Amino acid sequence: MIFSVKDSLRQAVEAASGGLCTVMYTKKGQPVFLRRIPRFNLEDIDPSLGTGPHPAFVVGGEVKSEIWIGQFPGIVSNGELISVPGVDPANTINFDEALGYARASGPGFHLMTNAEWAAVALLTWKSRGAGDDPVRGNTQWGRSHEAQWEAGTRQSGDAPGEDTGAQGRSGRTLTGSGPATWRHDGTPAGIADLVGNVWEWVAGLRLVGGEIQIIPDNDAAFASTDMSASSPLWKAIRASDGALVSPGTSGTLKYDINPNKSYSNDNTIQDLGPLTLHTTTQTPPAGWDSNTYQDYASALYKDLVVGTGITVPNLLKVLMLAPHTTSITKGRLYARPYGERLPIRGGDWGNGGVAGLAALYLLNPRGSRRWGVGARPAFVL
Ligand SMILES: [Ca+2]
Ligand SMILES: [Ca+2]
């Protein structure tokens, strides 16, 4: 027999997808549906963003031909974070668990990185008309908040659109079970559920007391790179020239609450004004750290407030940390400028226009486990 069930499935997936998708197999021989996104240059999105390959395609100094994105939200099976259709998306796992489960699959496999997310979002935006966020999804308890008649299959068994939070029933939908408009390119061969269903942990991005920090390029792809809190790998961004510099340096970019507002230590949560990007951080009340869940600051991605002196470096636009267009009317940005925060992207079933390609939620610490937050695998090489 030259024939295997596992290889024949791979071929079927490759065929049906015009060669855009495949199935790779994990260390433990489990299926990972993956969609290829070939390398593009920044100038192909908009020449005013700079030049060279998008960071998603640079791993350990080497420029890659393409990357592979998990076609579906990850699910944890045995001890691997795999990517398959028709299942309840992984949830209630923290950043380190997600990062680990992703790597367990073997060489190449990793927790999808902020650089990859950034690559897909920008490419999606440009390729679908360079207008708004082209993509929809499970952003209202099973269906799309923009489009009621687009729904997936709810794991809960409840009707799309029914808020069952109080009954402790989730609004997650089985992966890819929504229509093709819930896939990044409008076709069945697209990446599914990027927008909605569950938020997803991404690697290579971090907040420390409001200072923005990243793992350079797509270096977050290695199974060896230290993304713990103590890691010397994290770099900040200089705002004046956008160079990668050591954390704590003078002119580094930070997410901050609004200049026209102030932290209220009333043990009561307030959204403190349009989120602002400048080089300083308002001092929070004493004793507020990564385990403090209090006041924050949000803003629609298009509406992020740029500091009076600041020219936002292209680097931030490319990694989807600051808007480049304002044609984007969905996707909300959240940030707590105190403690260590790890990013989750895309939005879930209960957000609304908050969900979207540009949705970024930096209010939680790496330890947080929530029923509407999960992860998905990617592969390079
Ligand atoms: Ca999602
Ligand atoms: Ca407060």
Numbering used by the authors: 1 to 381
Original paper wording:
Despite the sequence divergence of these proteins, they all share a C-type lectin (CLec)-fold, which appears to be an evolutionarily conserved scaffold among DGRs for accommodating massive protein sequence variation. Variable amino acids in these CLec-fold DGR variable proteins are solvent-exposed and form ligand-binding sites.
The variable protein of the T. aquaticus prophage DGR, which we call TaqVP, is predicted to have a CLec-fold. The structure was determined and refined to 2.81 Å resolution limit, and the entire length of TaqVP, amino acids 1–381, was modeled. The structure of TaqVP revealed a single globular CLec-fold domain that strongly resembles the CLec-fold of two previously determined bacterial DGR variable proteins. Like TvpA and Mtd, TaqVP has the formylglycine-generating enzyme (FGE) subtype of the CLec-fold and, like these other two proteins, shares structural homology with human FGE (3.2 Å rmsd; 116 Cα; Z = 6.2; 22% sequence identity). The FGE-type CLec domain of TaqVP begins at amino acid 112 and extends to its C-terminal amino acid 381. We observed that TaqVP started to unfold at 70°C and was completely denatured by 90°C, as monitored by the loss of ellipticity.
